[PDB]
Each structure stands twice: as C-alpha cells, then as structure tokens.
Amino acid sequence: MRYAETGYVLEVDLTKGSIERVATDPRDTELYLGGLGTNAKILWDRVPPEVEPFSPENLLIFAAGLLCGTPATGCNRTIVSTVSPQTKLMAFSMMGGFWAPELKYAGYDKIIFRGKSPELVYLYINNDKVEIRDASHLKGKGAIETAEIIKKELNEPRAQVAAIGKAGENRVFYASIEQGRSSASRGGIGAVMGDKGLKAVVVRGTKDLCVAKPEEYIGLCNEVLDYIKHREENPIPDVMPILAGLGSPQEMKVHDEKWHTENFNWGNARTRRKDFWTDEVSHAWEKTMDKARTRLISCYNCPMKCGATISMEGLPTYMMKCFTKLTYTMAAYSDLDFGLRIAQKATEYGLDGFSAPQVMAFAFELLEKGILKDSDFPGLPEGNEERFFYLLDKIVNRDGIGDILANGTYWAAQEIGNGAEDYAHNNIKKHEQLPLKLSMLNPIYYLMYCTGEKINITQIEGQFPQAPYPKLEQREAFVEDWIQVPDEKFKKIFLEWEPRGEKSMPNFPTVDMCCDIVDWQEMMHYIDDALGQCAGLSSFPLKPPYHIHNYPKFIAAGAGIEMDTEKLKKAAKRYRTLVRAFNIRRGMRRVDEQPPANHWKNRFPELEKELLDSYYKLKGWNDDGIPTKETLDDLGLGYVGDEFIKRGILSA
Amino acid sequence: MRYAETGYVLEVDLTKGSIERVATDPRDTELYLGGLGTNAKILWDRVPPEVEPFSPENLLIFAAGLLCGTPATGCNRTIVSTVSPQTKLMAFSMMGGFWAPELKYAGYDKIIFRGKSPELVYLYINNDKVEIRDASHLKGKGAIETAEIIKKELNEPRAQVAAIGKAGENRVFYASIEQGRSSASRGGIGAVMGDKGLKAVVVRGTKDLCVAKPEEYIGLCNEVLDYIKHREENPIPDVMPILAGLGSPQEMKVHDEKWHTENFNWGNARTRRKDFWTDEVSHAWEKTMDKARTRLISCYNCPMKCGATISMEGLPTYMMKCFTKLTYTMAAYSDLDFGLRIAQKATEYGLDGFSAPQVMAFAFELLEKGILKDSDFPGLPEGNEERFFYLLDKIVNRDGIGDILANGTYWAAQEIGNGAEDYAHNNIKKHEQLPLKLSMLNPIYYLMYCTGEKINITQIEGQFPQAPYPKLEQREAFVEDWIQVPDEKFKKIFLEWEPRGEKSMPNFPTVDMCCDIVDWQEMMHYIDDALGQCAGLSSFPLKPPYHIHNYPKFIAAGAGIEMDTEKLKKAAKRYRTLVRAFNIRRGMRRVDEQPPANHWKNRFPELEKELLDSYYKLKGWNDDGIPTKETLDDLGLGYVGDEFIKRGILSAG
Ligand SMILES: CC(C)(COP(=O)(O)OP(=O)(O)OC[C@H]1O[C@@H](n2cnc3c(N)ncnc32)[C@H](O)[C@@H]1OP(=O)(O)O)[C@@H](O)C(=O)NCCC(=O)NCCSC(=O)C1=CCCC=C1
Ligand SMILES: CC(C)(COP(=O)(O)OP(=O)(O)OC[C@H]1O[C@@H](n2cnc3c(N)ncnc32)[C@H](O)[C@@H]1OP(=O)(O)O)[C@@H](O)C(=O)NCCC(=O)NCCSC(=O)C1=CCCC=C1
Ligand SMILES: Nc1nc2c(c(=O)[nH]1)N[C@H]1C(S)=C(S)[C@@H](COP(=O)(O)O)O[C@H]1N2
Ligand SMILES: Nc1nc2c(c(=O)[nH]1)N[C@H]1C(S)=C(S)[C@@H](COP(=O)(O)O)O[C@H]1N2
Ligand SMILES: Nc1nc2c(c(=O)[nH]1)N[C@H]1C(S)=C(S)[C@@H](COP(=O)(O)O)O[C@H]1N2
Ligand SMILES: Nc1nc2c(c(=O)[nH]1)N[C@H]1C(S)=C(S)[C@@H](COP(=O)(O)O)O[C@H]1N2
Ligand code: SF4
Ligand code: SF4
Ligand SMILES: [Mg+2]
Ligand SMILES: [Mg+2]
Ligand SMILES: [W+6]
Ligand SMILES: [W+6]
C-alpha cells in the first residue's frame, strides 16, 4: 500500500492519442521524494540532449507534490517540467491553487505528455475516466475564459483546469499556464504545451487520499497551524511590510511599495528612481488598489490569502498575486492603474509577467536608439501606454516584429543585431532576471544568481535575512527563537553580520559562510518543490512553520517511508544534483554561470572567483561546475557518472 | 510496501541487449495473484495472435510464484511461459528445485525476454547486478554440464542455473529447460529460448524476502509441517504405493511398477501387456534401481525428497523424478536399465521425456509399416536399444529424418504423409498425451483431456480419487477426515461411486458431478501454479496439507492483501479464464477439444456431448468453448470481452 503519493501516473501520447495508467517505482520515491525530484528522474531517463524543445520527443510533465492532497496546510503545488525553448535547459515551473490536489483525488501523481496532437485538444480526467477531447472551438480563447467554457461543456463545475492562452498556442517563449489564481509562469512551459496541440488539462477527483500514520500526521498539521497564528502575531521586527510575515510577498494586502519602486529599476531594468514614493503617489495607488481589489483569496487549504481577484472597470475579472502587480507598471514608466489593466490581457493570453514587460521595454529602447525602425512598428500609437497594449498583441500573435520579440530578449537581440545585444543586458542563461541593478557586490546573491537552476532569484532566496540589523540586541532577539536553522552556526553568522564596517559585505559573511547560507536557502526550495508545499509557508519567508526539522516527520508520517533530517538533506542534494547533471548534459558549463555584467557597480573579480570555486566544492562539483564521479556515486547517481564518462563530460 | 512478491521484474531485449528493472502494478497482484496468473496478463496484452512462436516479438517469461522465497514448505516453482512452437497455443511449464526462490532473494518476481540475440549468450543475475555474457564457448553442451562450467567460470558455486541443451539450441519443438534436479519440460519452451539465442539464466540472490504478518504465517507453515508428519504415518488405504502418499508420484522410492507396466501402453502408446509384471522382472528392475539410485533428494524447503540422483556405470550423473523413469523403457519395449541410460542423454540434450519417446516409437512404427524405409535412417544400427540412441542423436541435431521428427508426431505425420497421420493417434491440440488406451469411457477424465490448457492429464488431476472402493466401509473411512473438499457434496459422491453396477462409470458420477469434480481439481492446479506451490503438497496427491480453506490465510498473511475462500476461487477463475481467452484469440475452438478417437474402446457420443456441453456452461463459456461477455465482465475482464467483440470472436448481443 502506497501513501501520500498515489503510485500511478498517466502516460499520454498526443500523436497517437493513447492513454496509459502506469504504476510508479516506490524506490524513486525514496531517492527523489516526488514532484520536481521525480520529474527530473523522468526527464533524465527519457530526454537525451539531441531532443529539441519543439520536438515530439520533448516531454511535458504535470506533477502533484508528494504531500499534495493531504491535510498539510498550503501543500498544493503543481510542478510542470520540460525542456525550455528559451534557455534550451530544463524548465521546471510551480503552480499554486487547487489543480495538484485534484489530480491526487483523481488517483494520479503525474501526467506525462509526449508527442504532438495535430488537432487542438484538451485532456479530461475524472477519477478512472480519462479521455482526449476536441478543443478547436477553444482556439485563441484566454486561459481563464477557456476553463469556464470547458466546465460548462462537461457539466463539471468542481473541475480544475490548467490552460494556455493564445500566447501558448503561438509558442511564445515566455508563455505560461494558468489555473484560477495560479500560474506556471516561467521558462516557456506554455509554449511547449501549445506546441503539442494541448489547450487544457481538465481534472475532477473524488477518491480518498491516504496517509501512513494518521494521528501523527494531523498532529504535525495542527502544530503548523498553531505556528502560523503565533507567527502572525509576531511579524519580523524592523523589516518592510511585504516581507515580515508568512506567504508569498503580500503585495495584494500591503499598499506601501516604497522598497520596490525606489530600489528596483524601471523600464528595461534601466532606471533607478530613488525618491519616487511621494505622498501623492502613495495615496493615488492606494485608491486604485482599494477600488480594484474584490477579495483576498487563498490557495487550497491555506489561510494566508496572498492573492486577489482584481476588477478593473470594463474588464473581465482576473486573479493576481506578488510582483506582477508592478512589473508592467515599472517597465512602462506608468502607474498602478495601467499595470492592473494590461496584466489582465497578459494573464488571459498567458504570458510570463517577469519576462514580458522587459521584452517590451527592450523593444522600445531599440526603437528609440534607432536600432529598430519606426517602420517595424506599423500603425504604432504614440501614447506610451497605448504602445504597450499594441506590442503585447504583436508579440502574442507573432506578428511581424512581434514574431522576433516573441523569442525573448536574448534571441530577439541576437536575431536583430546592430548592437541590439547590448540592450539585452539583464539575462542569465538567456533568461530575464529581476530588474535589480544595485551598487555593492552581494556575495550571497552572487552565488544564487550564478547557480540557481530556476534562474530566478526570488525562487532560491528566503531563509536568511536579506540585510543585517544595525543593533546587536536586535540580532540577539532575532536568533533567540530561530529554530529553523539546520545548525547554530547560522545564528552566529547573523549575530556577527553588520550593515557597515569590518563585518559588512562584500567581505563578510566569509566565503565559507556564504556557501553554507546559499546551500541551505536552496535546499529548502528543492524540498518544497518535491513535496508540493507552498514556499510561502516554507522556503520563502523568514521563520516558516515548515522547516528542516519537522519536514522529515511530515514525510515519514505522510508517505510511510523512513526519513530524518540527514536523509532529507541528502535526498534534496540528490535531485538538486540530478537537475544539475541534466543541464550539464545539455551544454551548461561554468562559463554560463555569471550574472549580468552591470548587476553591481562595484565588482570584486577575485572574491567572486573564490566564491564560485568554494561553492562548487561544497556542492561536490569540479571547477567547471560538473558533479564529480565521486559525488555522483555517493549520491547513488552512479548511472549519471557512467553516462558522463561515456559522453566525455567527465574523464575517468 | 510490497510483501511476498518483490514488486519488480526484469525486462530484457536480447536484440538490443537492453536490461531494465520495472516495478509492477499491485492491482495485477490483486486480480491475478502471481506466477502463471500474471504471466498470462503479460502475454495477453503484449503478444497478439499475429505473432509467431519464432517471431522476435514472442516473449519468454520466467516467473517465481507469489509465495516462493517465503518459509512455505515446497513453495519453490518457476513458471515459464511463451507461445508454443508445437501447439501454437500458450505454453506454461513448471520447474521446481531451487531457481525460483533464488530469483526472489535476488530481488525479482519475473524475467521477461523479448527479441533475439544474434550471438549465443547467457544472463547473469547477482542481486542488483545484471549482465549479458557471451555463451559461445558453451555451444552444444548439455544443460547440467553448461551449469557447472558457468558456475566455475563466474566463481559462483551457489548460483542457480536454468539451461538448454543441444535440443533447445536447435529448436526441437519439445526441447526442455533444465535446472539441477528440475525441468521445465513440455510445450517447447526450450526451443523459444534457443531461438532467442539464450543458453542459460544464472541467478545468485542474497537479499531478504519479507512477509506481512510474520507470526500468523509461520503458524500456518508449522501447521503444514504437522499435517505432513501425520499424513505420512497414514497413506491412503488400499491404494497403489506411488500415489498413496504426499509428493510427486514417488517412482524413485517405490520399486513396484506393476500399475504402470500393466495398464499403460508400451511402444507408440500401442501395446497393452496385461501380465508384464512378473517376479522375474520385479527382481531385475529392483536390482537396477537399487544400484543406480545414489540419493533421494528434495526441492528447496521440502522434506518429500521425490527425486533421485541416478548413476549408471560409465555415464555422467543426472537427476530424475516421476514417470520418465518409465517412458523410454516402455516406448522401446525394453527394461529399466536401458530407460535410465538413454534418459541420461535425453536430459543433457534437454528433451521432454513424455514426447521424445513417443516420437521415436512412432518413427519405428512407420518404419515397420513401410511408410518410412531404411533409406530414411542411413547408418541405422541393428539392435533395438541401439536404434533408439541413434534416433535420439538424429532428432537433437535435426539431422535428416531427425529434422522432421524434431517437430513432434503431429507435424511429422503431416510432413511424412502416406498414411503417417493414422499413427500419430495420441495427440490433443498437436501435443502427445500419456500412453493410456483404456477400455471404458471415464467421464471425469474425458472432461480433463478436452479442456485442460496445460494439455497434460497429470497436471490437472489429483484431488478426487481415480477409482472407487469396493467396500462402503472404505469409502466412509476416507471421507471422514477429508477436510480438503470445497463442499460436502464431494464426500457423498465418493460414497455412492462403485466399480460395477448402477452407480458406476460412465453414467455415475452424473454429468453435473463430473463438472464440479473437474472444476475443483483444475482450480487447485491453477492456485499452485500462481503461488509457486509444488503440486506434490497440494493439487496432485489426495488429502494434501495445502487446500482451498487455508490457502487464503497464506496469501493474506504472506502477501498482505485481503483474501478469503470465495475471493481465491474467483481469482483462480479469473486467470484460468484469461488463459482460455488467450488460446481463443489464437484460434482455439470446441472442435480442437477432442481426445484421440481410440482413447477409450467404449465410447458414448451422446453423453460426451452432454459432458462438454455442461462443463462449458459451468465455466461460463459459449457452446463453442468461448468465455461469454457476461462472465468476462463479471471477472473484471471486460477488456477481454471488448477485444473479442472487436475481432468478431464474440457477436454483440
Ligand atoms: C535591495 C536592497 C534595498 C539593496 O540594499 P542597498 O541599497 O543598501 O544596497 P546597494 O545598492 O548595494 O548599496 C547602497 C549604498 O551602500 C553602499 N555600501 C554597500 N556596502 C557598503 C559597505 N560595506 N560599507 C559602506 N557602504 C556600503 C553602496 O556603495 C551604496 O552607496 P552609493 O550611494 O555610493 O552607491 C536590500 O534589500 C538588499 O540588500 N537586498 C539583497 C539583494 C536583493 O536583490 N534583494 C531583493 C531580491 S528581489 C526580492 O526579494 C523580491 C521580493 C518581493 C517581490 C519580488 C522580488
Ligand atoms: C486405469 C486404472 C488403474 C484401472 O482401469 P481399468 O482397467 O479397471 O478400467 P478399464 O480399462 O476402462 O476397464 C477394465 C474392464 O472393465 C470393464 N468395465 C469398466 N467399467 C465397468 C463397469 N462400470 N461395469 C462393468 N464393466 C466395466 C471394461 O469394459 C473392461 O473390460 P474388457 O475386458 O472388455 O476390456 C484406473 O486408475 C483408471 O481407470 N484411471 C482412469 C484415469 C487414468 O487415465 N489414470 C492415469 C492417468 S496418468 C497418472 O495418474 C500418472 C500417475 C503417475 C505417473 C504418470 C501418470
Ligand atoms: N514550492 C514552491 N512554492 C512557491 C514558489 C516556488 O517557487 N516553489 N513560489 C512562490 C512565489 S514567490 C509566488 S508569487 C507564488 C506563485 O504562485 P502561482 O505559481 O500559483 O502563480 O508561489 C509561491 N510558492
Ligand atoms: N502569468 C503570470 N506570470 C508570472 C506570475 C503570475 O502570477 N502570473 N508570477 C510572477 C512571480 S511573482 C513569480 S515568483 C514567477 C513564478 O515562477 P514560476 O511560475 O515559473 O514558478 O512568475 C512571475 N510570472
Ligand atoms: N505448481 C506445480 N507443481 C508441480 C507440478 C505442476 O504442474 N505445477 N507438477 C508436478 C509433477 S507431476 C512433477 S513430476 C514435478 C516435476 O518437477 P520438475 O518440474 O522440477 O521437473 O512437479 C510436480 N509439482
Ligand atoms: N526432460 C524432462 N522431461 C519431463 C520430465 C522431466 O522431469 N524431465 N517430467 C515429466 C513429467 S512426470 C511431467 S509431470 C511433465 C512436467 O511438465 P512441465 O515440466 O512442462 O511442467 O514433464 C514430463 N517430461
Ligand atoms: S501562502 Fe499564499 S500563495 Fe502560498 S498556499 Fe497560502 S494562499 Fe497560496
Ligand atoms: S514434493 Fe517432491 S517435487 Fe514437490 S517440492 Fe517436495 S521434493 Fe520437490
Ligand atoms: Mg508559479
Ligand atoms: Mg517441470
Ligand atoms: W513571486
Ligand atoms: W509428473
């Protein structure tokens, strides 16, 4: 008897229209846990480097986390995985809401899509009943719009739908997948879905989902709820609002956006506006938000209600959370009202709200520098906001210039030329970063930009504070009840750490301290992404209810496998290394692991080399960023080491 | 977590040399239990009827039964499965000894071979280590001899080896697979294995094998050991020694062979010798066997020591059990000394001891009657004994007439022509039956010859007595402690049944009594062949320690899944019916289900129709032997019914 997981996946061949339920190997659960980890095993095993993103043999995997469908608060994440058309590397992407738990109640842990459907279709799951339906009547329709039409069609009001918009259908490289108040946003996972002729995945489930140790498990869940209450009455002192509590960045609740608007860059990650947040702006954006925000709403089985239904006059309602509230606004040098309006269109089209704003601001920089012509934007309006709505439509239809921009700043620049590459200045591994151009090198963030397989800073940070406290007693207070640390050395680091002087960055924390910090922050994310646990109650906020000390108890009581703190750390390291190996096999080397040239105004080449060198060694990789044969063997990834040798990636 | 079964199989593609471990689906254990049952599910959805026996897409499966590797006494059977090159139907074949347990301790429930290796290879398993080795130095070597060379070669003296001899390498249609004192003998599984270029499968295993409810399970084991003790202090009264106790027919222990020699047909199932067993012959054969039998030896975890190492002067030692002690002897009209000598060669070649002798005896009949002439046997020696050794070599090398004879009597007859057919008079579905030509219709045995999917009367019979007692007092004594019957109906039947008179065959037992009796006897074999339990302690002998009432307890406490008598009965029904449907998909029909014209001297067309008409209904089949859509939906085999409807085998409505 399997627990927590269902022990079954669906294999779907969209070319042949075949559908097969397949029992999983319980050993893969012990080694790789579930979610992202087991996705990485499937991709390693079945997608060799000769496979292109828009090749039939590319896989699109929808995974429900190990503990999704259990009573674990906030444990509801879907992990979508494939090879990215933008980065040509592995792309995994997380989605909240209600879809993953529904897949579990239907009896499945994953759906694995291979092939391509000639006709636009959608997959319909209802417990044991699985079938492929014609979706041509859904062509071009928005992601939310599509879900609503389908639930009508099928008479399944309680079904969960993950869908693409027109942007997905047209294989826009940063096209997302949307489900109610949730989104698998980055990496172009939506483009692959469109490429396979897959319009939506509709699931309804009414079966039981069992846990192994019933009372132990519910006990841990209450422990978490108690901690969520306590923690809510005790926000982290002296820290800006949107990051003092639990949850995803609480930007739908908090009106104050001084930190973001004054420290992040506007336009094409170009312009700092140090004194932007006037009283006049604060009042105007609060008015817009109060009027537009219908309700704060939660994902499945969670009280934090991070997201919000948003209603702009004369526009369909949509749902939003976190930073997409500002990225369109800031990239366009506009106001919050504009942001919320265009975000509505872009959500329905199904576009990544991080990359898309920067692509458009990239385009207008080129148009202004004359590198692009005005004849490349035919019928172009000349009001600034109108031009953003205009280009959004060119991109989503791959129309003329939109066809090039639809490929992202890296490829658009390379395809354009005339020094367009100079303006694609905010990429790592061909993927747009957050619009941050700070002054002083940050040793911890340096390592995170360089090595993160999600290639997104907000999805590798969290557990260690972003800044030190000025006063010693503030730090003593903070580390006092910091139970989430793996080792008390993390307390001592934060005690010593100071904003200014001989114990400040970039020289302190030390290189070894920075390696431990990045390793821990990263580890927690990978655990979240295998369990399906929302980072909002785990790896993202300071002092979460889930941590390295009770996670082993959740896994043991939930899935009925042996698990403790050490074994879990090792598990996390195992599929973190496997994801690494997957990208190594696709061509990634040390050379690729470098932040934008202009990401800090003060650079320290020798400190940075020493940082990356020491981090690689901590990981157990060689100086080209490849996992060694020794590390692979000890992790039980011998088959990886063997293939590395056979492929010349490692020499014996 | 999985119990009793390991939960994994090895997928092996011999064309490409790919080796892959795959986890199984615990729902398949629920529906089909293990062993033969799950073999059948595998064959059903991976081997469609367009596939030939020697097609690279044919599958060759080695399965350890569900309870092999546990402490259950005598639970050690490998189940081999493939499509038969001789019958073109499913072939399953059981081999005892030590191989299945070892596979379980290595960590696997089955090995599934597909494709064909261009070069001769063997597969070597040692726990998680699995590799394909070149076997070319082994070409032509005997099965046991191959085993010994491999173990020394690998430095694996405790490994278990299943191997083919020359006969298998040459695709003899009745080639066997041999393993110590054990053999997967019938249906030609050895030819498929040679055809795939696979010379042996070596397995060493040293991992734990777990049960769900430790205490309950060992409790049940102790109960069987107890029953085995008292059952051996109480042989069934007034019955032939070889079949009065537990185990496979105890022919290596019992020297009294009066029963066989006087009631079975010598030669090509031809000659009865009503008074063969003289005092002079008994002393002669007793002397032979005393000298030749080195030791009585057992399969894994069993006290019955049914088999024997046999050592003939100047020959390599081999092992033997059951009726091959006599088949060569009788086919050649010879003595036991000859039987044991030629059976040594035949065993090393890897040949089925039932078919081979009849094939040779049939050849010499045709020679006598001039259908074959001396030109067909260049260099044929003069002596009778010497001729048999000559023809054995011809057949194994598919040399000359041997090439035709290596196909079995049914195909050889058709190819030889000129009246050869009339002499291939002991086949059912192109498969040689035991040399039995009785005088009066036995209605119970009529049913078992017709429908049995193993197509061998000795692997479907057992639980009901073959004959009645002369006195009622005897009948009453027997049924008093007969706890094994599924219902009490069976005790009453045996009480009424008498040798001569009103309550005697073929009219008693009635047509309905015969069907219940044949259902039960068959079901127990299918349970044994799923669990890997030796029939010698179960479906074969009267009053066994395993039976329908405690088997569910073993499955529950061993495998950790719900089971009770009714669910087990229905499970056995489920995969027995699946095997039926597989043979239907490959074209079998009621027409194929006749015994030989001459199997009994006194026949009854009317009763025989009614017998088979009734039995079909009880199984839930058509009047053409096909499982109806309703009975298929009931057994959770809707998907079978569907395919049958798609292919026009069952009409919709
Ligand atoms: C962003 C941030 C405000 C930057 O802080 P700061 O402004 O202090 O940093 P700064 O620009 O480097 O330097 C300022 C001045 O100090 C000076 N100086 C430096 N070192 C000095 C020394 N040792 N001694 C003396 N002076 C030293 C410098 O030279 C400079 O002076 P200048 O006028 O002469 O040029 C802070 O939160 C941080 O550190 N973030 C971490 C990294 C990050 O990107 N985090 C956010 C990730 S996204 C996220 O989390 C999200 C959340 C929600 C939704 C979406 C995303
Ligand atoms: C063969 C057997 C030993 C005795 O048989 P019998 O000779 O007694 O029966 P018979 O030959 O039919 O008839 C004799 C005479 O009586 C007459 N007559 C008959 N009924 C009559 C009546 N009611 N009333 C009046 N008269 C009746 C007949 O007409 C005839 O008279 P006739 O002078 O005119 O010709 C008994 O076990 C049996 O029949 N088994 C059947 C199943 C079978 O095949 N078993 C073995 C399966 S393999 C196995 O188990 C192995 C084990 C170990 C290793 C390998 C394999
Ligand atoms: N396991 C996991 N949970 C996560 C994240 C993640 O990367 N991994 N991202 C967080 C952030 S920063 C946001 S804005 C939301 C995004 O929710 P969505 O995927 O439904 O749009 O998920 C949060 N939960
Ligand atoms: N369409 C869409 N894109 C989006 C978002 C969203 O909510 N909707 N969230 C943004 C935020 S805040 C984050 S943290 C990332 C989430 O990354 P992921 O969905 O690939 O896991 O997407 C960004 N892009
Ligand atoms: N499960 C099962 N056990 C069985 C049998 C069988 O058909 N199924 N055949 C019995 C008979 S009649 C004999 S002679 C021996 C033969 O053992 P072997 O296959 O190792 O040569 O197995 C006995 N045990
Ligand atoms: N080579 C060989 N053939 C043999 C035997 C044997 O032990 N060795 N056993 C005979 C007996 S007594 C039986 S019951 C069957 C067993 O059939 P199976 O091994 O195909 O299951 O084969 C017969 N042919
Ligand atoms: S913390 Fe917020 S984003 Fe995470 S599950 Fe709860 S409501 Fe959803
Ligand atoms: S009864 Fe005989 S053939 Fe069966 S397992 Fe025991 S020793 Fe082997
Ligand atoms: Mg997401
Ligand atoms: Mg056998
Ligand atoms: W976010
Ligand atoms: W036998």
From TrEMBL, chain A:
Aldehyde ferredoxin oxidoreductase N-terminal domain spans which residues? 6-207
Annotated residues for binding of [4Fe-4S] cluster:
C299, C302, C306, C534
Q: Name any cofactors this protein relies on.
A: tungstopterin; [4Fe-4S] cluster
Concerning InterPro entries, the annotation shows: Ald_Fedxn_OxRdtase_dom2, Ald_Fedxn_OxRdtase_dom3, Ald_Fedxn_OxRdtase_N, Ald_Fedxn_OxRdtase_N_sf, OxRdtase_Ald_Fedxn_C, Tungsten_al_ferr_oxy-like_C, W-dependent_AOR
Q: Which residues form the signal peptide?
A: none
TM stretches of this protein: none
**Binding, Zn(2+):** E251, H255, E257, H260
Going by the UniProt record, its keywords in alphabetical order are: 4Fe-4S, Iron, Iron-sulfur, Metal-binding, Oxidoreductase, Zinc
Output the superkingdom of the source species.
Answer: Bacteria
Record-level Gene Ontology MF annotations: 4 iron, 4 sulfur cluster binding; electron transfer activity; metal ion binding; oxidoreductase activity, acting on the aldehyde or oxo group of donors, iron-sulfur protein as acceptor
* Binding locations of Mg(2+): M94, S183
- Family membership: Belongs to the AOR/FOR family.
Name this protein carries in UniProt? Benzoyl-CoA reductase, putative
Q: Which organism is it from?
A: Geobacter metallireducens (strain ATCC 53774 / DSM 7210 / GS-15)
